[PDB]
Amino acid sequence: YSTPKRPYESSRLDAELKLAGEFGLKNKKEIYRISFQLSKIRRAARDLLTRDEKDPKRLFEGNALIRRLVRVGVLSEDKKKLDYVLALKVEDFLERRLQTQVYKLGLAKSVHHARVLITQRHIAVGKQIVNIPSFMVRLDSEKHIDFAPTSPFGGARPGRVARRNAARKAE
Amino acid sequence: DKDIIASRLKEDVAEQQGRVFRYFGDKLLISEAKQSFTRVGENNLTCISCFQPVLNKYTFEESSNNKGRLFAYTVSKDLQLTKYDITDFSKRPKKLKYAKGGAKYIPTSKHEYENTTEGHYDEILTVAASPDGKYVVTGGRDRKLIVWSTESLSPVKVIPTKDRRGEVLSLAFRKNSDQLYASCADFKIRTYSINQFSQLEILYGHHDIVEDISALAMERCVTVGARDRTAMLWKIPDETRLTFRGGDEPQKLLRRWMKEPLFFCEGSIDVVSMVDDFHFITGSDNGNICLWSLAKKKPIFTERIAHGILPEPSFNDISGETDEELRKRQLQGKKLLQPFWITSLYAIPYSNVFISGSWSGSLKVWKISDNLRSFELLGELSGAKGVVTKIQVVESGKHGKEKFRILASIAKEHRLGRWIANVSGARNGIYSAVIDQ
Amino acid sequence: AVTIRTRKVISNPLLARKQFVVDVLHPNRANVSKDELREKLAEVYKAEKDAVSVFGFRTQFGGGK
Amino acid sequence: NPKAFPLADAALTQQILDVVQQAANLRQLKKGANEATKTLNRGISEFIIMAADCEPIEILLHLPLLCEDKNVPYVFVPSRVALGRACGVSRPVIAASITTNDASAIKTQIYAVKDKIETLL
Amino acid sequence: GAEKKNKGRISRYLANKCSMASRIDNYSEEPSNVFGSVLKKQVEQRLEFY
RNA sequence: UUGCCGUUGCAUUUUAUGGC
Incomplete structure (x- = not known):
């Protein structure tokens, strides 16, 4: 978390409203968390730009930074230079979280249904059941998301309501 | 004697060691097998x-x-x-x-x-x-x-x-x-x-x-x-x-050829077998046959288009024009040739030999080199006119003398989709080759 | 049906004792019942349920292992 | 320049076929010639793919006259059965079209493919 | 008026067959008849279920 | 040998081809 400088601007209020609305968020603190890590990631990216080209500090840590950001997927591999990290912005960071990513993957039909069936422990990334929205699925594990093995949307037993109503229809 | 000690080691201790031991590459004549087809009418x-x-x-x-x-x-x-x-x-x-x-x-x-x-x-x-x-x-x-x-x-x-x-x-x-x-x-x-x-x-x-x-x-x-x-x-x-992973790109293959010839990129890996616990072979969608180890990522030895390239369509069913010059030009030379992407592959375990099958009408038999980094032809088994869904090899004989029966299931379409390109006279059946010595 | 595997089997004749990290995979059971799993571990080893001893367990998040 | 002109080479063929496969698994791909021209004049078509070994070629060659009118890019590939396997369906398709969707997870790959084929033409 | 259930699905079959035939003899610059013949054989073998 | 169709060949089997 990190609080803004002047938080009560109507421009920032409409900003938080739009981002929370079309990405399905729960308050402004999620926006502030990933905006703080975006701010520290490009504040660490700009001083490497201000120092000299082929300074091995710049070379190694810039290739380190863009190797991390390609693997998270906020930086496409066609733009493998450090000033594109400066050009990066926060909707690319909350595009990669698990809630929005599963809604783009289908199987959820709305962003808030994506959030709520994540929180019902229904969705596992490959092997591990994950019950948090803010997850930042990496580019390799993008295509590993399906329903959990121990979930009625997966292949497990039908749930509580299903077998209760099946018993009352047996009555 | 020493030969009986060697035979007792090759009984099981070689296969629990888990390296390729049962060498019968050059020992195996191929070109005179008993290549019997069997028709079974049960629809691919x-x-x-x-x-x-x-x-x-x-x-x-x-x-x-x-x-x-x-x-x-x-x-x-x-x-x-x-x-x-x-x-x-x-x-x-x-x-x-x-x-x-x-x-x-x-x-x-x-x-x-x-x-x-x-x-x-x-x-x-x-x-x-x-x-x-x-x-x-x-x-x-x-x-x-x-x-x-x-x-x-x-x-x-x-x-x-x-x-x-x-x-x-x-x-x-x-x-x-x-x-x-x-x-x-x-x-x-x-x-x-x-x-x-x-x-x-x-x-x-x-x-x-x-x-x-x-x-x-x-x-x-x-x-x-x-x-x-x-x-x-x-x-x-x-x-x-x-x-x-794969990683054979056609421009670099052109760099390897340009010292002195068509080949194309890799659609999809399709089939596997493993020749020991330390090497395995795969067959891809560009006909490529890869021989791979535990220790490296790139192919050790990738044979090229294995079963050849599919025949191009005729003049008569490419464009519906009347003039043969325009229906020649509609073929675009060799540019739309696509390979015989192989459909089944099998290696006899811990053996010098493996076999590969697609709808070229013919099984292809291959022998790994002694240093386990290359492989080559051994012959050709032409009675299996059709697509090869799966090959399995069964054996008999002595401790050194072998009598093999290759069983290749043959259909007239691929075992997943339908995907024919005018398969010419494929009986649903079993190819069965007795091959000896 | 569960499957118990072991890993990093290092011997230790300083205590005449063979130590390892055990991991059980139970796909649908709750837990693996320390006594029952230690007697199955003694069965897959040489002998002596009373002389095998497994002690450091935890079930990972989401269940299963 | 025979009739099916922008025919992709091997590497571009393979990357457009893998983006076809993930589009089909995401249910963003509409397949076949008449469903292709239906989504073409609906207007939701990002780019279209046509197999240039069909029997004969004109059955999909009707599609360039609509697509370059409505300003969407169009590629030919060398094989119907390759396109069928890449669509994830049992019969050989010859035409395929990516519906535009902003709720896609494949959007950047779609756009990179589009830039490569537009520089191809 | 034209394109002369059991008539409905064969009307649809004839419809997309003749649309395909139209594509052939339009975009072919100097058309042949052999594809029209094989389309005719296809649609007659199709309606020969009755 | 095969769900159907065309076959070598018996002193009935026999036998490997090509159409759905």
Whole structure:
């Protein structure tokens, strides 16, 4: 978390409203968390730009930074230079979280249904059941998301309501 | 003497060492096999799983239950598995027993895990007969898998995959055991114990439809998924994997040629077998045959377009013009030639030899070099006019003298889709080659 | 049906004792019942349920292993 | 320049076929010639793919006259059965079209493929 | 008026067959008849279920 | 040998081809 400088601007209020609305968020603190890590990631990216080209500090840590950001997927591999990290912005960071990513993957039909069936422990990334929205699925594990093995949307037993109503229809 | 000491080592200690030992590359004449075709009219046969009883299973007490005859099991696309006797070499595989699946094997719950109905919905894909000869598992696009008895073919148990899209695409037994690695097209590999009739562990981490699997004595699995150009080698008892990618691009192949000739990129890995616990071979969608080890990522030796290139269409059915010059130009030279992408491949375990099959009408036999970094032709087996769904090799003879029976299931369309390009006279049947010495 | 595997099997004749990290995979059971799993571990080893001893367990998140 | 002109080479063929496969698994792909021209004049078509070995070629060659009118890019590939396997369907398709969707997870790959084929033409 | 259940699905079959035939003999610059003949054989083998 | 269709060949089997 990190609080803004002047938080009560109507421009920032409409900003938080739009981002929370079309990405399905729960308050402004999620926006502030990933905006703080975006701010520290490009504040660490700009001083490497201000120092000299082929300074091995710049070379190694810039290739380190863009190797991390390609693997998270906020930086496409066609733009493998450090000033594109400066050009990066926060909707690319909350595009990669698990809630929005599963809604783009289908199987959820709305962003808030994506959030709520994540929180019902229904969705596992490959092997591990994950019950948090803010997850930042990496580019390799993008295509590993399906329903959990121990979930009625997966292949497990039908749930509580299903077998209760099946018993009352047996009555 | 020393020869009897060597034969006692090559009894089992070589195969528990797990390196390629059973060298019969140059020892094996090829060009005079008894290459008998057998027609079976059951609508695109899709699998072959032979079963030979191994004598004295690592202690004594010769085999498991007849006493000592071989078998084969096979699978249609219109829901019929058939049990063939193969034990009489230089004789046709005789049909023995039959089991079909109709529409009445559709359940009525239809929306849960329970596919308890014993037969099949539709489109049975592949079998595997257990090396202790009690059961044969079967599995297809109906998200089940069945244990059939090896005598009366009675549904011992039905194992559902418990999935919306878990079509079972290839099964494999770990040899001299009854652990079963099924390769389900929801990107996963399942493990089953047949004697416990249960599911040990499900193992994820692939990236597309895991369409072929292979296994050997130790707890390895080598699977390939299709549209990710990769090959996963699973080691279970430490629970990890190894990702061997392709990486042969045509511009760099042009750099390797331009010192002094068409080739194209890689669609998809299709088929696997593993020649030991330390090397395996795959067959891709550009006809490429890769020989791969444990230690490296790139191919050790990738043979090029293996079964040749498909014939281009004629003048008569490319454009519908009248003039032969324009219908010549509509062929675009050689630019739209596409390879014979291979459809089945099998290596005899710990052997100097393997075999590959597609719809070129002919099996191709290959021999690995002695230093285990190259391989080459051995011959050509032309009586299998049609698509090769699965090849399995059964053997007989002495400790040094061998008598082989190659069994290649032949259909007239591919075992997953339909995808023909004018397949010319393909009888649904079994190619069966006796080859000796 | 569960499957118990072991890993990093290092011997230790300083206590005449063979130590390891055990991992059980139970796909649908709750837990693996320390006594029952230690007697199955003694069965897959040489002998003596009373002389095998497993002590450091935890079930990982989401269940299964 | 025979009739099916922008025919992709091997590497671009393979990357457009893998983006076809993930589009089909995401249910963003409409397949076949007449469903292709239906989504073309609906207006939701990002780019279209045509197999240039069909029997004969004109059955899909009707599609360039609509697509270059409505300003969407169009590629030919060398094989119907390759396109069928890449669509994830049993019969050989010859035409395929990616519906535009902003709720896609494949959007950047779609755009990179589009830039490569537009520089191809 | 033209294109002369059991008539409905064969009307649809004839419709997309003749649309395909139209594509052939339009975009072919100097058309042939052989594809029209094989389309005729296809649609007559199709309606020969009755 | 095969669900159908065309076959070598018996002193009935036999036998490997090509159409759905």
